[PDB]
């Protein structure tokens, strides 16, 4: 494992302001805990992380453009180190 | 309190004989190439 637990990173105007406070946000799986992500970012990026915060996101409605549908649920995790650098952009 | 019979197309068009609007005064502006309202003024109608 330690590769399928990390999908893609979030690049918005809020995550860009968290780079100054050393806080990278990633999109993990909806089955991992707050300890499996600490052993997947400290090996892939090889950096001693400090703390980690996670939050669940409910699915949205749909759009009139297409037809009545639904969206997939996501799981955000804000990992913050205190000595390492960035591994993305 | 309820119509006993239905009205025709002749008795309904006879009631709408006075139902209309009247023409305006149309006080032609002296010299400006516009139209001012009776006893009034406009940005185009100089007079």
């Amino acid at each position: 494992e330690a590769r399928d637990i990390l999908k893609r990173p979030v690049i918005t105007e809020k995550s860009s302001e968290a780079m100054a406070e050393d806080k990278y946000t990633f999109d993990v799986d909806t089955r991992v805990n707050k300890t499996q992500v600490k052993m997947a970012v400290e090996e892939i990026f090889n950096v001693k992380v400090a703390s980690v915060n996670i939050m669940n996101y409910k699915p949205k409605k749909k759009r009139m453009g297409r037809y009545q549908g639904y969206t997939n649920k996501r799981r955000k995790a804000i990992v913050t180190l205190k000595e390492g650098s960035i591994d993305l952009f | 309190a309820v119509p006993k019979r239905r009205t025709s197309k002749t008795r309904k068009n006879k009631r709408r004989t006075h139902f209309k609007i009247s023409v305006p005064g149309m006080t032609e502006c002296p010299n400006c190439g516009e139209y001012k309202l009776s006893h009034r003024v406009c940005k185009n109608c100089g007079s």
Partner: protein, 119 residues
């Protein structure tokens, strides 16, 4: 005399218009309102001509005690300007003579718009 709302409401509104037409020179409102504020504003200009203490106290029973002039860049409180500028500019027999100019109707309803400027 004409009406519009309730006794108290009408009185309040009238005072507002008068004070708004004393610190803005020309204003635009409805027909009925412009034909009712042309008798409560001319009476206020007649009290400003006298220039005595009694009249001043009687002129503060209608004019709002606020609306600090901002175009004069000072602390003018209506009355001062009315008992100093407006009063010292009229010498006719119609005291606070004012003219009204009719215009086209409004889009919202059918009320005939009008403009009442000082003269």
């Amino acid at each position: 005399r004409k009406l519009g709302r309730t006794s108290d409401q009408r009185k309040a509104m009238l005072r507002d218009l008068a004070t708004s037409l004393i610190i803005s020179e020309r204003i635009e409102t409805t027909e009925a309102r412009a034909k009712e504020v042309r008798s409560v504003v001319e009476k206020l200009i007649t009290l400003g001509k006298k220039g005595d203490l009694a009249s001043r106290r009687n002129a503060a029973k209608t004019l709002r005690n606020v609306e600090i002039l901002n175009e004069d860049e000072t602390t003018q409180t209506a009355l001062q300007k009315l008992f100093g500028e407006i009063a010292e500019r009229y010498t006719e027999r119609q005291g606070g003579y004012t003219r009204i100019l009719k215009q086209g109707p409004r889009r919202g309803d059918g009320a005939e718009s009008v403009i009442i400027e000082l003269v």
